[PDB]
Amino acid sequence: GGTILVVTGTGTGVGKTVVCAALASAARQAGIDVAVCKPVQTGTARGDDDLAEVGRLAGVTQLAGLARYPQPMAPAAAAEHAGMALPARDQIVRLIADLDRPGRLTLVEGAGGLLVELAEPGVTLRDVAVDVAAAALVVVTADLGTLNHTKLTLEALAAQQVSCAGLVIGSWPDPPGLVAASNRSALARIAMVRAALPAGAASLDAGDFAAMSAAAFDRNWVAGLVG
Amino acid sequence: GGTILVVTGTGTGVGKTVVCAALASAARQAGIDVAVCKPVQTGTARGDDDLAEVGRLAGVTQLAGLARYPQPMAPAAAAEHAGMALPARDQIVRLIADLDRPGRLTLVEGAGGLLVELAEPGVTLRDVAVDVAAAALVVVTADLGTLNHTKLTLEALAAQQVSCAGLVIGSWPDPPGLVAASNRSALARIAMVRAALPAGAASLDAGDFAAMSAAAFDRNWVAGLV
Ligand SMILES: O=c1ccn([C@@H]2O[C@H](COP(=O)(O)OP(=O)(O)OP(=O)(O)O)[C@@H](O)[C@H]2O)c(=O)[nH]1
Ligand SMILES: O=c1ccn([C@@H]2O[C@H](COP(=O)(O)OP(=O)(O)OP(=O)(O)O)[C@@H](O)[C@H]2O)c(=O)[nH]1
Ligand SMILES: [Mg+2]
Ligand SMILES: [Mg+2]
After folding, report:
1. What is the free-text note on the cofactor (chain A)?
2. Where are the domains of chain A?
């Protein structure tokens, strides 16, 4: 098959989606075919749609969803609120498995952070990553607390032998501060820091985003993600 | 000795200090002798002082610390800003065991989350908890994201055989809301919720605080700690 990356993060609202659109855009401009997948989508009644936003920003056409829930809460709670069920583990794995093609990078965004339940019983993105033998890209903040949460997540991946593809700082302030700079320096000591997307990257139009995406990642690391 | 609890949390600013003060205040009204250790305190320029918070709110006088840094940063970065090192592991563990005696509940507050660097080189409250054979009380929020951060902290505790004494919600909102109410039922499914402290409890006078604290925890559980 090809190259599957779950794009997780240290929590909700850390830039997972914008990192998916950014790595996809950079991969695309490098010649890579790119699929982006969002198996569990909460908050649709407030207009949350990460797939739609990834296409808006990077022009990705190959966009796969499965389960959708109106309320902006944990998938488990969003589902029970609507009288609906969470997808089964094998439904998520099948959705991804179908996208996987040689020479294609498939990106899988979770809901919130690594151990949020996506399927009953207690099935997380970590288990999905194990089933499709994926590596995990961990989107982190530069804010304080980030180091505790990053190391908690890297430990959670390594306990299941899910390989860490690295970190992406999902928002980077221009210019940083003392904590923001110490965080970055401390992050880059326990894991490779693939990118640092400028804050507000989610407001850039096509070209700027594509310009940002290409400079945001080391072209060699991208093109090396999928042979 | 007696009982040693590390009071960790899922992050910075979740209420570990108020929870220390509340458990201390409930254990004291149970006739239990209480000490609190905060080996490393940061943000001393803006006046942060968690042990004095506990002294005031709860009435504890056995209040032990080893190092104080001016800058409001994590200990390591605050130590680096100040050109000086963090204390050593041996100091922190021995300070805590010297506090520990029979009949006494000893509570240890680190800084921020479970894995932030607390002593030289790169040692954490988790390592400290291992060395002193402490259980961990885990302070949590009821805000979106708490289940991920909670499951992560419990997993990291279990990975080093550090027993979980339960969860405490550091600030219970008024009125809840669907996310906070839902998050509380889900947290009860992953571990015991020992208490949920009303929001703003950190500001109560010592007599009000002690009333709240007595009500907030279960009498038999608190007794059974020592
Ligand atoms: O109150 C606010 C303000 C801003 N935002 C907006 O959040 C965007 C960045 O957030 P992302 O949506 O890219 O992070 P994420 O992928 O990890 O989020 P989840 O799947 O877990 O939901 C930014 O564009 C920011 O403007 C909010 O969500 N809430
Ligand atoms: O907007 C904000 C942000 C932060 N804070 C500050 O965040 C903290 C809230 O909560 P605490 O600092 O009292 O709980 P804690 O014991 O878990 O935190 P640490 O020991 O690790 O530092 C307090 O220091 C509070 O002053 C606010 O009050 N308002
Ligand atoms: Mg998202
Ligand atoms: Mg504190």
Report:
1. Binds 1 Mg(2+) per subunit.
2. 1-227
Q: Give the residue from B152, B153, B182 with the most A CB atoms within 10 Å of its CB, the best one to mutate.
A: B152
Q: What are phi and psi of A82, to 5 degrees?
A: -90, 10
Alpha helices by DSSP H, chain A? 16-29, 50-58, 75-81, 89-99, 125-131, 146-159, 178-190, 206-216, 219-223
Is the domain A1-227 a CATH 3.40.50.300 member? yes
Report the run of H or E that residue A165 belongs to, with start and end: strand A164-172
- Ligand number nearest CA of A204 is 1
Torsions phi, psi for B90 (to 5 deg): -55, -40
In CATH terms, B1-226 corresponds, of 3.40.190.10, 3.40.50.300, 3.40.190.150, 1.20.1050.10, to: 3.40.50.300
- Kindly state the DSSP code that residue A40 receives in the 8-state scheme: E
Q: Does the active-site annotation cover A151? A: no
Method: X-ray
Give the distance from CA B180 to its chain's centroid.
Answer: 21
Q: Is A131 annotated as a binding residue?
A: no
Ligand 2 atom 24: residue of nearest CA = B13
Residue A155 phi, psi dihedral angles, 5° rounding: -65, -40
Query: At which residue do the structure tokens 């056995």 appear?
Result: B62
Position of tokens 């559980």? B221
Measure Cα distances from B81 to A143, A152, B174 in Å: 17, 25, 39
Ligand nearest to the CA of B144: 1
Chain A residue nearest residue B179, CA to CA = A73
Identify the active-site residue in A8, A9, A23, A38: A38
Q: Residue with the nearest Cα to atom 13 of ligand 2?
A: B15
Q: Which of B28, B38, B104, B184 is catalytic?
A: B38
